[PDB]
Amino acid sequence: VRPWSEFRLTPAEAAAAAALAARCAQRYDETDGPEFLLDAPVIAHELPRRLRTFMARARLDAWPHALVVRGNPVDDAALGSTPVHWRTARTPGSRPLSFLLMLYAGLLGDVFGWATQQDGRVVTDVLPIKGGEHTLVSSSSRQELGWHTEDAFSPYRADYVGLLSLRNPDGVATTLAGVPLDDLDERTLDVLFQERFLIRPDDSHLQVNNSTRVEFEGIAQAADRPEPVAILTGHRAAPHLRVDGDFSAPAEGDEEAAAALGTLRKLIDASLYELVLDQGDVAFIDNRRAVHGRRAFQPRYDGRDRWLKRINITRDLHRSRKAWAGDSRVLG
Ligand SMILES: N=C(N)NCC[C@H](O)[C@H](N)C(=O)O
Ligand SMILES: NC(=[NH2+])NCCC[C@H](N)C(=O)O
Numbered sequence: 001v002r003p004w005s006e007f008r009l010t011p012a013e014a015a016a017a018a019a020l021a022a023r024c025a026q027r028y029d030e031t032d033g034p035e036f037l038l039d040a041p042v043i044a045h046e047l048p049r050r051l052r053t054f055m056a057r058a059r060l061d062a063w064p065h066a067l068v069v070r071g072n073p074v075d076d077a078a079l080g081s082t083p084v085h086w087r088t089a090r091t092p093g094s095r096p097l098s099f100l101l102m103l104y105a106g107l108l109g110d111v112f113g114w115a116t117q118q119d120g121r122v123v124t125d126v127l128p129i130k131g132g133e134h135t136l137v138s139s140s141s142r143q144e145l146g147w148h149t150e151d152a153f154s155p156y157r158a159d160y161v162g163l164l165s166l167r168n169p170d171g172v173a174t175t176l177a178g179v180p181l182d183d184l185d186e187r188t189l190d191v192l193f194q195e196r197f198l199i200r201p202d203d204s205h206l207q208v209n210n211s212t213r214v215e216f217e218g219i220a221q222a223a224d225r226p227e228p229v230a231i232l233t234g235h236r237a238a239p240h241l242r243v244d245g246d247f248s249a250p251a252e253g254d255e256e257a258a259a260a261l262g263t264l265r266k267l268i269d270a271s272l273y274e275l276v277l278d279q280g281d282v283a284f285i286d287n288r289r290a291v292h293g294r295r296a297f298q299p300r301y302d303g304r305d306r307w308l309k310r311i312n313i314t315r316d317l318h319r320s321r322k323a324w325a326g327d328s329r330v331l332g
């Protein structure tokens with residue numbers, strides 16, 4: 001038994017999916033281009049039927065923290081070395097796999113990026129950056145990436161975060177936890193449902209973590225003057241979750257809120273579990289049901305470091321209309 005839902009491709013299914021992604025990579029200039037963004041969800045209809053059935057059904061299940069698809073082939077020789085920075089990470093060897101991620105994602109929802117993260121790319125990169133080992137972003141290594149709701153600070157945060165493992169030779173675990181409903185007392189639960197918490201943008205939205213405009217103003221506003229929000233929403237018997245283990249704080253001087261958040265931190269720490277994304281595995285983490293992070297690891301810096309492609313997915317792009325930054329697919 002697992003807290004996520006898992007699908008394993010047969011070799012024939014995996015080869016068919018790879019061939020579809022390869023054909024897309026031949027026919028379109030880039031994954032993030034307007035043309036492929038529009039076409040991917042319809043092209044995805046040509047993926048193996050058993051996979052389409054899994055994605056359609058598993059998304060509607062009440063319980064999973066993630067949907068995990070195993071068994072996509074990745075040839076390290078074709079892939080080439082792990083890039084030294086996300087800027088240079090759109091390598092030809094990784095290009096078909098980026099298209100593949102986009103196709104799988106298009107079965108689940110509308111993909112988007114952030115003006116203030118990796119130059120507004122929709123398909124982004126997770127890899128260790130030398131000098132960045134002890135940061136709070138996904139290019140860390142030696143310091144554990146603490147558990148978080150992705151883009152907790154924002155009302156426009158993803159419903160699902162997709163991760164495709166290009167390589168992970170040493171088996172470094174992603175971490176996950178759901179709401180600790182078996183342990184939260186009613187009074188604590190009640191407080192977590194009230195708008196008594198602060199949650200600021202994480203460091204990935206800082207200018208220092210993009211390349212050499214206006215959307216950074218909103219990040220500054222969210223950091224300097226966060227509005228109180230709830231941590232839990234929806235059904236008390238199955239809440240949705242919005243929290244950042246580093247950055248969540250109580251509203252100013254609200255000691256009851258503080259106690260509830262402290263209790264939540266302890267209970268999530270105690271229930272955190274591991275999911276290892278081996279080479280070729282894809283996970284779609286349910287960003288309303290679960291927090292996620294990544295274990296500490298010693299980076300290699302020898303060309304074979306752990307490397308993921310990543311994508312944000314919303315069920316409804318129109319929900320973020322306000323934040324459409326001169327187009328609907330890059331937000332700020
Ligand atoms: N480290 C914490 N607690 N939160 C922010 C980390 C996020 O995963 C961020 N989007 C990143 O990619 O670095
Ligand atoms: N949304 C679009 N305009 N799609 C068509 C773009 C052309 C692309 N090379 C193709 O194979 O179709």
Ligand SMILES: [Fe+2]
Binds near residue numbers: 148150292293
């Ligand atoms: Fe994350």
